Design a protein around this motif. Structure first.
Motif, PDB file in Angstrom:
ATOM      1  N   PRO A 149     -12.457 -44.837  38.635  1.00 57.34           N
ATOM      2  CA  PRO A 149     -12.346 -43.891  37.521  1.00 57.34           C
ATOM      3  C   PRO A 149     -13.708 -43.331  37.134  1.00 57.34           C
ATOM      4  O   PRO A 149     -14.763 -43.811  37.555  1.00 57.34           O
ATOM      5  CB  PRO A 149     -11.769 -44.738  36.385  1.00 57.34           C
ATOM      6  CG  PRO A 149     -11.132 -45.921  37.038  1.00 57.34           C
ATOM      7  CD  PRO A 149     -11.523 -45.964  38.489  1.00 57.34           C
ATOM      8  N   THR A 150     -13.672 -42.295  36.300  1.00 54.81           N
ATOM      9  CA  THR A 150     -14.903 -41.742  35.756  1.00 54.81           C
ATOM     10  C   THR A 150     -15.527 -42.712  34.762  1.00 54.81           C
ATOM     11  O   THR A 150     -14.829 -43.415  34.027  1.00 54.81           O
ATOM     12  CB  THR A 150     -14.638 -40.396  35.085  1.00 54.81           C
ATOM     13  OG1 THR A 150     -13.639 -40.550  34.068  1.00 54.81           O
ATOM     14  CG2 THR A 150     -14.177 -39.384  36.112  1.00 54.81           C
TER      15      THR A 150
ATOM     16  N   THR E 107     -11.236 -46.831  32.809  1.00 57.83           N
ATOM     17  CA  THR E 107     -11.529 -45.404  32.760  1.00 57.83           C
ATOM     18  C   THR E 107     -10.961 -44.766  31.500  1.00 57.83           C
ATOM     19  O   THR E 107     -11.614 -43.925  30.871  1.00 57.83           O
ATOM     20  CB  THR E 107     -10.960 -44.719  34.000  1.00 57.83           C
ATOM     21  OG1 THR E 107     -11.062 -45.601  35.126  1.00 57.83           O
ATOM     22  CG2 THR E 107     -11.717 -43.447  34.298  1.00 57.83           C
ATOM     23  N   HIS E 108      -9.752 -45.155  31.116  1.00 57.10           N
ATOM     24  CA  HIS E 108      -9.100 -44.601  29.944  1.00 57.10           C
ATOM     25  C   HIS E 108      -9.198 -45.583  28.790  1.00 57.10           C
ATOM     26  O   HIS E 108      -9.061 -46.794  28.976  1.00 57.10           O
ATOM     27  CB  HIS E 108      -7.628 -44.313  30.226  1.00 57.10           C
ATOM     28  CG  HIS E 108      -7.388 -43.098  31.064  1.00 57.10           C
ATOM     29  ND1 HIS E 108      -8.401 -42.266  31.487  1.00 57.10           N
ATOM     30  CD2 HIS E 108      -6.241 -42.580  31.562  1.00 57.10           C
ATOM     31  CE1 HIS E 108      -7.888 -41.286  32.208  1.00 57.10           C
ATOM     32  NE2 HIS E 108      -6.579 -41.454  32.268  1.00 57.10           N
ATOM     33  N   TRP E 109      -9.439 -45.055  27.596  1.00 60.98           N
ATOM     34  CA  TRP E 109      -9.396 -45.863  26.392  1.00 60.98           C
ATOM     35  C   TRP E 109      -8.736 -45.054  25.288  1.00 60.98           C
ATOM     36  O   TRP E 109      -8.840 -43.825  25.251  1.00 60.98           O
ATOM     37  CB  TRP E 109     -10.801 -46.344  25.987  1.00 60.98           C
ATOM     38  CG  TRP E 109     -11.580 -45.410  25.127  1.00 60.98           C
ATOM     39  CD1 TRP E 109     -12.459 -44.454  25.538  1.00 60.98           C
ATOM     40  CD2 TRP E 109     -11.580 -45.366  23.699  1.00 60.98           C
ATOM     41  NE1 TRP E 109     -12.992 -43.805  24.454  1.00 60.98           N
ATOM     42  CE2 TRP E 109     -12.462 -44.347  23.312  1.00 60.98           C
ATOM     43  CE3 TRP E 109     -10.897 -46.077  22.710  1.00 60.98           C
ATOM     44  CZ2 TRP E 109     -12.689 -44.029  21.981  1.00 60.98           C
ATOM     45  CZ3 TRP E 109     -11.127 -45.761  21.388  1.00 60.98           C
ATOM     46  CH2 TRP E 109     -12.014 -44.744  21.036  1.00 60.98           C
ATOM     47  N   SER E 110      -8.048 -45.755  24.392  1.00 62.18           N
ATOM     48  CA  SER E 110      -7.380 -45.116  23.270  1.00 62.18           C
ATOM     49  C   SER E 110      -7.364 -46.077  22.093  1.00 62.18           C
ATOM     50  O   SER E 110      -7.813 -47.219  22.190  1.00 62.18           O
ATOM     51  CB  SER E 110      -5.958 -44.690  23.629  1.00 62.18           C
ATOM     52  OG  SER E 110      -5.110 -44.836  22.507  1.00 62.18           O
ATOM     53  N   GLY E 111      -6.824 -45.603  20.979  1.00 54.61           N
ATOM     54  CA  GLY E 111      -6.653 -46.426  19.805  1.00 54.61           C
ATOM     55  C   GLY E 111      -7.767 -46.230  18.790  1.00 54.61           C
ATOM     56  O   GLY E 111      -8.857 -45.743  19.095  1.00 54.61           O
ATOM     57  N   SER E 112      -7.469 -46.618  17.556  1.00 56.01           N
ATOM     58  CA  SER E 112      -8.420 -46.496  16.464  1.00 56.01           C
ATOM     59  C   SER E 112      -9.491 -47.571  16.565  1.00 56.01           C
ATOM     60  O   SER E 112      -9.190 -48.750  16.769  1.00 56.01           O
ATOM     61  CB  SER E 112      -7.697 -46.610  15.126  1.00 56.01           C
ATOM     62  OG  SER E 112      -6.724 -47.635  15.177  1.00 56.01           O
ATOM     63  N   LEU E 113     -10.743 -47.160  16.421  1.00 56.88           N
ATOM     64  CA  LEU E 113     -11.852 -48.098  16.423  1.00 56.88           C
ATOM     65  C   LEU E 113     -12.096 -48.640  15.021  1.00 56.88           C
ATOM     66  O   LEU E 113     -12.038 -47.911  14.028  1.00 56.88           O
ATOM     67  CB  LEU E 113     -13.129 -47.440  16.948  1.00 56.88           C
ATOM     68  CG  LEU E 113     -13.161 -47.071  18.429  1.00 56.88           C
ATOM     69  CD1 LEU E 113     -14.399 -46.245  18.744  1.00 56.88           C
ATOM     70  CD2 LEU E 113     -13.106 -48.317  19.290  1.00 56.88           C
ATOM     71  N   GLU E 114     -12.360 -49.938  14.954  1.00 62.25           N
ATOM     72  CA  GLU E 114     -12.806 -50.607  13.742  1.00 62.25           C
ATOM     73  C   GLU E 114     -14.315 -50.445  13.650  1.00 62.25           C
ATOM     74  O   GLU E 114     -14.995 -50.438  14.673  1.00 62.25           O
ATOM     75  CB  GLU E 114     -12.419 -52.084  13.785  1.00 62.25           C
ATOM     76  CG  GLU E 114     -12.661 -52.859  12.523  1.00 62.25           C
ATOM     77  CD  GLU E 114     -11.997 -54.219  12.547  1.00 62.25           C
ATOM     78  OE1 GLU E 114     -10.948 -54.361  13.208  1.00 62.25           O
ATOM     79  OE2 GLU E 114     -12.537 -55.154  11.922  1.00 62.25           O
ATOM     80  N   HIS E 174      -4.173 -38.085  24.673  1.00 64.79           N
ATOM     81  CA  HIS E 174      -3.752 -39.408  24.236  1.00 64.79           C
ATOM     82  C   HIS E 174      -4.780 -40.481  24.563  1.00 64.79           C
ATOM     83  O   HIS E 174      -4.665 -41.604  24.062  1.00 64.79           O
ATOM     84  CB  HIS E 174      -2.414 -39.770  24.881  1.00 64.79           C
ATOM     85  CG  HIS E 174      -1.226 -39.225  24.153  1.00 64.79           C
ATOM     86  ND1 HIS E 174      -0.692 -39.832  23.038  1.00 64.79           N
ATOM     87  CD2 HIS E 174      -0.467 -38.128  24.384  1.00 64.79           C
ATOM     88  CE1 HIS E 174       0.345 -39.133  22.612  1.00 64.79           C
ATOM     89  NE2 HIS E 174       0.502 -38.094  23.411  1.00 64.79           N
ATOM     90  N   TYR E 175      -5.791 -40.199  25.351  1.00 67.26           N
ATOM     91  CA  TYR E 175      -6.689 -41.316  25.719  1.00 67.26           C
ATOM     92  C   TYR E 175      -8.034 -40.749  25.986  1.00 67.26           C
ATOM     93  O   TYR E 175      -8.186 -39.963  26.925  1.00 67.26           O
ATOM     94  CB  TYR E 175      -6.180 -41.945  27.012  1.00 67.26           C
ATOM     95  CG  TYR E 175      -5.146 -43.054  26.949  1.00 67.26           C
ATOM     96  CD1 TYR E 175      -3.790 -42.770  26.921  1.00 67.26           C
ATOM     97  CD2 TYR E 175      -5.534 -44.384  26.995  1.00 67.26           C
ATOM     98  CE1 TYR E 175      -2.845 -43.779  26.890  1.00 67.26           C
ATOM     99  CE2 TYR E 175      -4.600 -45.402  26.967  1.00 67.26           C
ATOM    100  CZ  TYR E 175      -3.254 -45.098  26.914  1.00 67.26           C
ATOM    101  OH  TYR E 175      -2.331 -46.096  26.890  1.00 67.26           O
ATOM    102  N   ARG E 176      -9.010 -41.125  25.183  1.00 60.59           N
ATOM    103  CA  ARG E 176     -10.378 -40.665  25.479  1.00 60.59           C
ATOM    104  C   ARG E 176     -10.829 -41.434  26.716  1.00 60.59           C
ATOM    105  O   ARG E 176     -10.533 -42.621  26.814  1.00 60.59           O
ATOM    106  CB  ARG E 176     -11.255 -40.873  24.248  1.00 60.59           C
ATOM    107  CG  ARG E 176     -12.264 -39.752  24.084  1.00 60.59           C
ATOM    108  CD  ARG E 176     -12.873 -39.912  22.719  1.00 60.59           C
ATOM    109  NE  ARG E 176     -11.837 -40.108  21.703  1.00 60.59           N
ATOM    110  CZ  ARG E 176     -11.655 -39.279  20.693  1.00 60.59           C
ATOM    111  NH1 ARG E 176     -11.868 -37.988  20.861  1.00 60.59           N
ATOM    112  NH2 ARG E 176     -11.262 -39.741  19.521  1.00 60.59           N
ATOM    113  N   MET E 177     -11.477 -40.754  27.645  1.00 59.25           N
ATOM    114  CA  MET E 177     -11.893 -41.409  28.897  1.00 59.25           C
ATOM    115  C   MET E 177     -13.344 -41.826  28.763  1.00 59.25           C
ATOM    116  O   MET E 177     -13.906 -41.665  27.670  1.00 59.25           O
ATOM    117  CB  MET E 177     -11.876 -40.419  30.059  1.00 59.25           C
ATOM    118  CG  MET E 177     -10.598 -39.633  30.184  1.00 59.25           C
ATOM    119  SD  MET E 177     -10.654 -38.680  31.712  1.00 59.25           S
ATOM    120  CE  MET E 177     -10.976 -40.016  32.870  1.00 59.25           C
ATOM    121  N   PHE E 178     -13.917 -42.344  29.838  1.00 55.96           N
ATOM    122  CA  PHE E 178     -15.363 -42.656  29.838  1.00 55.96           C
ATOM    123  C   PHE E 178     -15.908 -41.846  30.981  1.00 55.96           C
ATOM    124  O   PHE E 178     -16.300 -42.445  31.992  1.00 55.96           O
ATOM    125  CB  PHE E 178     -15.575 -44.158  29.999  1.00 55.96           C
ATOM    126  CG  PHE E 178     -14.928 -45.045  28.944  1.00 55.96           C
ATOM    127  CD1 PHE E 178     -15.524 -45.223  27.703  1.00 55.96           C
ATOM    128  CD2 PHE E 178     -13.753 -45.731  29.213  1.00 55.96           C
ATOM    129  CE1 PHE E 178     -14.940 -46.039  26.749  1.00 55.96           C
ATOM    130  CE2 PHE E 178     -13.176 -46.548  28.256  1.00 55.96           C
ATOM    131  CZ  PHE E 178     -13.768 -46.698  27.027  1.00 55.96           C
TER     132      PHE E 178
END
Lengths: 295, 236, 31, 247, 247, 295, 236, 236, 31, 50
Positions: A149-150, E107-114, E174-178
């Protein structure tokens, strides 16, 4: 709405419908397409039951044809001796549809497609003739195909120690074997792949245009596992992607002009018609002059 | 032909020679449901303030007019309370109520395929470089078509009718109405760096008349329908 | 006719069974 | 089970296979699907919509002037306005249509063709007009009386300003193909010929360059079959970004 | 059964396969499982816990002085204390977090950060303090009035001595990536900016080097998707014990 | 407790909750993590139903990625002629996770893991170029991979007569073949693999530190079955272990510094930041100076 | 803040400015069940004698104090009846009730991440040799941190909060309580050659005050909870 | 004393040493009912976008600080989406959630009558001329008190407690919260040419301490509650 | 979806079905 | 059935496999089992003796 049609619709019998006050054929273009069906007007149809194939023209049947997306004939040798950006037994192909115009046109038919990429990696070997080497057999190299992945660091060497694959997805398949039928999922943070993206990837003004940051699937780093042979081969890795599980949105004009760049949709047609900028369709001699006529 | 009144907010548009509107893709615009949402932030939903019809700069139509396009919400990025909310919010969801009025006389021979392209990835002729900010985000003034026949993206105007479209054929149509809903892969996405819709008005048949030549203005009034906004930040 | 023995629903066969379709989205996008 | 013999069609990457394939991401939950507008579950939904033909396939018609056709007030009756080779594959007016570009992906095509022509003229521009579609078997007609015997329809411009001729499905076979030989029983669809009926009557203040815009769509019985690879695009060289996405 | 044809995805070691594999030890009964504490059945349990960022990413801040931030009693109001690039992948304050190191595998991340910041000061060290998180789309703010328009929260130190700002999940996708390009719509999360609200009031006997310790955790809606290989470690050479465990 | 959650939790609608006497956001760090959820305070949330992927971030999904644990390119020749501790057609790899830092970091995420090691042994052949031999084809050697527990005598030769495997587990797989998908079980006398062990293996004071005697799985002695060829090959045996049946305990700080030794957790970072001893995170120019800014 | 009394055996600890305790991993300490046991020997279970809170050597906290750690049961290997039972038994099972008191004034600016690492496999800087007995088993005096930022094992203090932890932030917390249960892969394992828990107190924020500098001692009192012992042998 | 969390929009304020809030005149803020309304226009009600707490310019508090005042919505006329909606709408209705934080140490001797004057008709000393725009509408920076004892209008600070008020007495109160509803004779009235509320913070007892003199900033965060807007016009 | 034809329970497919998890072990390890 | 993909652990002689193997003698009826003394069905019966 609520049409669950599986076959082509049958036409009903039409009679002399010469009625005052309403008309089927004189429609309005300036809303959308027209609703004048065959038994409504312009013909006196017959009742024919229509059993024609609609499954073959399904959008999944249209799009689950495994077509080429990257053909890399990278040179497999002791690249160490002398190589500069020469695919040192491995290439970091950033996964883009846009490299080969057939499947690129098929996926650029639609603005949005949610699909799973059935990636089949067919790898062919050829002994390179620049060194005048003999044939000496085509070897059965185990060829690692790591999808990163990126954000993950792409490798820089053949033995780059990023091929350990502690969490990265990779397949280890030989060439004297069936090709690596692997399925990369819906690897998008959005609900569809924006095949077209009228926007910029970065928040800065100098970002590259048209590349969706959601559609950066990553790189498909394909390498040779075993060490370099004394005789050089030209390993040609052809990755074919079958858009599987197709859900398509907003069909578009197909790309008529020949493609120019992967990253954007820049255009320049042929030097005359057909498929030219000033003439997409090949020109006739006159408006009333009719080509391909039986006489 | 068909009278039509579009009353949203303080603005109202009454047209006497329009056709039926163009509810796009069978989808009336709506707010984000509790299931389709992806941003925990409460949306602004600044209705009335941003659902107003925003009358843009009317471009002149002549015999040599190739085409004009406007990108949504780039055409409305700096206009009104919708522009203020777009600058003040990082996430947005708004459908658009296009109404394009081309008031021409009954002696006028011409037509406009007023087409609404979702994600018009514009190309550039004879160069492989991507178009920049000055070739994509023109803003409220919009951008002209250098090559409208290829739809300025390598595709085809002929097939642009798969898009939400009407025609402003000056025989019996002086105004066209396209009802765009929200359309993106993301439920909400950055307005100032993405164009979810691109409204393009192309003189497919150029204005013609042996009558008094009079600027036939192409008055564009886009009402951003069902406005939603997340991520309240500074004015970007 | 499905030989999906994997634990992921995406990795199944290409579902050429979505016969239902609504042509009025693009043919008659009115009222 | 344990006794398994390999078929002759083993180890073959049939591009058109549907066999399930290993998930590369193993417990990968995909993105939740939102109700995006314009889902096309069948390409026959794309072909059932209007698409302009390029009636002026003319070297003088450069760029914008190919979709429209400039008809005028001719001083002779029963005059031919234009003829459309109803050939989707033979790079004719249709090729560049959503019923034609998509059917260029398919070797087989069937179903009744829609033929909707709008009048891009003034309101005072009046005149009846006839759209003759003739089934194949003879030459393309150039006169009205030899073309009105086929599928013709008379169109007074009026108020709705657009007629929809319907091409009927006349064929000995069930599916006309795109054999690349227009003059083939199994390939020729016929000829759509347009004629003056009562001439284009235009006033002095209206332009005598009144314009017809045609569309060809599909009907609900239209069907495409054997899927081929459209000859529209041609990758004679690698595109820009090749050897750079590889980097 | 007997008629078996080999798929194209045969003989492939898909690192992420789940296919059952031959037992090397054939009737091997494993050890009985005891109730060990701290079973993690999901990594999203590890990310939902606090983890210090390195706010002082400074060459003067060597070793221990990177987690803490020495704020003082500035003589000017509306002053910027620190800004955190909320970039998990771009080696920012977060990278070294249990919400960031684990999301560097994905690679994909989502959800509210604390966003939980504690005050490591004296009891008499008082002063309100504001944690501005702004959604991406503009520059990182340096003044209070252009940053309080975003997700801000005013924190009087008081008795509990720790605020928990919650980063909301604002994204078009729906998912911020890196994507390794912080300045990417699909990659930028925004900027968390910390400002003085009523200044750090400290007595004479208390040190004017009062320290903030922040944490970023995850919430119960946080999710990571495509699993990549974290760029944190690098095996440019073989470790010690290689060529010796081989012996 | 008692949470059987399969998807991400939906947030509920939040209003103006400005209430005196209780507060969600001002928590206490000095117990543990905080319980301030999104609709409790600091934002006025909207009711969004959350259908995001939690199966992909499962700890089994995290850890059942088959990554490299031993890459030995042992030289396959008539080692008899001239060889000293040179992998005489066989290597006695003591089974340790710790050789390759990707899967080592993945398993050193947790203090304890009970798992079954799906060991896939991908073997690649390369003709060695030191003798300037020709390619002459890549041979299909049957390669024995014998797993010996501790206490069993490791072999000393290729034909060492310890490859009889009367009770030792071994696989006999060729190279022109799929790799040996074998599963070594939970081979631990304790109920978990102590990936970290704050103790000494022996009862004596001079025992080596950090090696759990329970986690000594043994040696994976991999050999070449057939006799030496006149042309020398470099057989590269890459063993990939997929922690299957994952049960993990006590998650830990991940290893930020580059790894140094297999047997211990000795550390030395890079010469500057990032991932250095005095600076794990790459330094910014100042505390308020913000990197990667769109302007 | 919260008062808390920990009464086990003859020892009792009363703190007036503590937070809630840190029952580790949701697990209160318990004896070995008849199912989890692996040693047929009857356990000693010397409650009260070994569940006492053992106050260790209090280390001085200054501005340059990097960190201190104690390994359990190596910190209690030679202390009290628990130390005698550890020397007299080859197998042991005991959770630990950590209570660390840092009595500082209300004018003091500092904090201590009092972290309890399970199996702290310590590393050594700039050498590949494993740490010996003199670098691991310091005993009752404990060992200091040369590099507490890397948590002295190659990992990270920042993420040490995944471990059983509190903070002794001197604003409103002078004492922290971590309730460690038994934690090993084995149900019972050798105490004198293994450290199932490692309690580490790190001045993440170093003590600060412009007030009278006074040794801020870090008083460590570890009560071995739910003590079990098998394999009664000579005093090793 | 009393903890208090005010969560409106993306902004949230947590204070640990505040008193009970000051719900003004027994009236929680509300939108215009269908009976009290006077403008047929649909209100914008841009909640979340304009109900955010807007942290203003913090004024320094010294021993010679006479007083500071902010007029609502003149203090928020050019700030955020509320400022954009105020400029874009001729009619407005919004209550205000005042939160003023004065973070001072426990050794600090001072108090602030944080008073919210409805329609502070300010006077000018020794001249009969009315105050102009530069003496009334200072904006986001606010205006200082030349004579806070007379409440700068001829009245009296002593009796200013009939107004919505608290005190920020630095003994046991570092933050004060006044919950202003909408208050005007008109249900909706022009924001940029009228101040329905005027929040005034007056050092009735000036800050005192023999401790390290540290700027005691008076951080003012006004959240416009229950926002309503009519008459969508251009940006005035 | 499980093709475990071996006689050992350890040699089955990788069980990616342990959806139940208790985050209060590490997030809220109190009382 | 017909669609079969080969696993990575194919063609491997795992010495400790239990997979059924082709009968070399095809209808071979073995010798009838008599009650011989001292059947050891588990080695832990051998180790439990002096």
């Amino acid at each position: 709405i609520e049409s669950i049609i599986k076959t082509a619709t049958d036409t009903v019998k039409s009679e002399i419908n010469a009625e005052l006050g309403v008309v089927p054929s004189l429609n309005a273009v300036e809303t959308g397409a027209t609703s004048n069906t065959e038994p409504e007007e312009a013909i006196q149809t017959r009742t024919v039951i229509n059993q024609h194939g609609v499954s073959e023209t399904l959008v999944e049947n249209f799009l689950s044809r495994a077509a080429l997306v990257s053909k890399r004939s990278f040179e497999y040798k002791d690249h160490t001796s002398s190589t500069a950006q020469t695919d040192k037994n491995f290439f970091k192909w950033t996964i883009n549809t846009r490299s080969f115009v057939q499947l690129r046109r098929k996926l650029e038919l639609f603005t949005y497609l949610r699909f799973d990429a059935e990636i089949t990696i067919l790898t062919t070997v050829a002994v390179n003739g620049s060194n005048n080497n003999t044939y000496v057999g085509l070897p059965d190299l185990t060829l690692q195909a790591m999808f990163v992945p990126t954000g993950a660091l792409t490798p820089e060497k053949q033995d780059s120690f990023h091929w350990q694959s502690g969490s990265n997805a990779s397949v280890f398949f030989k060439i004297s074997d069936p090709p690596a039928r692997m399925t990369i999922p819906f690897m998008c943070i959005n609900s569809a792949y924006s095949v077209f993206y009228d926007g910029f990837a970065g928040f800065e003004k100098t970002g590259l245009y048209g590349i969706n940051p959601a559609d950066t699937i990553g790189n498909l780093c394909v390498r040779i596992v075993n060490e370099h042979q004394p005789v050089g081969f030209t390993v040609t890795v052809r990755v074919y992607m079958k858009p599987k599980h197709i859900k398509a949105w907003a069909p578009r004009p197909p790309r008529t002009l020949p493609y120019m760049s992967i990253a954007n949709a820049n255009y320049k047609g042929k030097e005359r018609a057909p498929n030219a900028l000033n003439a997409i369709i090949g020109n006739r001699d006159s408006v009333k002059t009719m080509p391909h006529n039986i006489v | 032909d068909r009278v039509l009144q579009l009353k949203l907010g303080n603005s109202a548009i009454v047209t006497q020679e329009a056709a039926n509107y163009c509810c796009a893709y069978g989808e009336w615009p709506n707010y984000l449901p509790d299931h389709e949402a992806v941003a925990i932030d409460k949306p602004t939903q600044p209705e009335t303030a941003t659902d107003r019809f925003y009358t843009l700069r009317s471009v002149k139509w002549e015999a040599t007019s190739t085409g004009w396009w406007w990108k949504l919400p780039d055409a409305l990025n700096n206009i009104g309370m919708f522009g203020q909310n777009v600058q003040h919010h990082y996430l947005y969801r708004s459908g658009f109520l296009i109404h394009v009025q081309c008031n021409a006389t009954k002696f006028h021979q011409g037509a406009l395929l007023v087409v609404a392209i979702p994600e018009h990835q514009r190309g550039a002729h004879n160069t492989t470089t991507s178009p920049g900010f000055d070739d994509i985000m023109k803003g409220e003034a919009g951008g002209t078509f250098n090559h409208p026949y290829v739809l300025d993206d390598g595709t085809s105007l002929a097939c642009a009718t798969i898009f939400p479209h009407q025609w402003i054929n000056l025989r019996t149509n002086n105004s066209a109405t396209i009802v765009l809903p929200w359309m993106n892969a993301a439920p909400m996405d950055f307005p100032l760096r993405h164009n979810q819709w691109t409204l393009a008005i192309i003189p497919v048949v150029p204005l013609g008349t042996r009558t008094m030549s009079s600027m036939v203005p192409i008055t564009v009034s886009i009402a951003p329908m069902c406005c939603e906004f997340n991520g309240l930040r500074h004015a970007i | 006719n499905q030989i999906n023995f994997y634990k992921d629903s995406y990795a199944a066969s290409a579902s050429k069974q979505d016969f239902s379709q609504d042509p009025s989205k693009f043919t008659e996008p009115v009222v | 089970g344990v006794p398994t013999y390999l078929l002759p069609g083993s180890g073959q990457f049939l591009t058109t296979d549907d066999h399930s394939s290993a998930p590369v991401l193993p417990c990968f939950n995909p993105t939740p699907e939102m109700h995006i507008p314009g889902q096309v579950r069948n390409m026959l939904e794309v072909v059932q919509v209007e698409s302009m033909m390029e009636i002026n396939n003319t070297e003088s018609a450069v760029g914008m002037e190919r979709l429209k056709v400039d008809i005028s007030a001719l001083t002779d009756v029963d005059q031919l306005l234009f003829n459309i080779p109803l050939d989707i594959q033979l790079d004719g007016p249709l090729r560049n249509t959503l019923v034609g570009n998509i059917s260029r992906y398919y070797t087989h095509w069937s179903g009744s063709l829609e033929m909707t022509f709008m009048f891009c003229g003034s309101f005072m521009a009046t005149g009846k007009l006839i759209l003759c579609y003739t089934p194949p078997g003879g030459s393309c007609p150039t006169t009205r009386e030899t073309a009105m015997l086929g599928t013709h329809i008379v169109w007074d411009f009026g108020l709705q300003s657009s007629i929809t001729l319907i091409i009927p499905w006349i064929s000995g076979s069930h599916y006309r193909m795109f054999n690349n030989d227009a003059k083939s029983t199994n390939a020729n669809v016929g000829y759509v010929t347009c004629f003056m009926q009562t001439n284009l009557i235009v006033p002095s203040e209206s332009s005598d360059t009144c314009s017809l815009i045609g569309f060809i769509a599909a009907k609900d019985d239209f069907s495409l079959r054997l899927m081929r690879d459209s000859p529209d695009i041609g990758q004679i060289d690698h595109l820009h970004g090749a050897e750079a996405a590889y980097q």
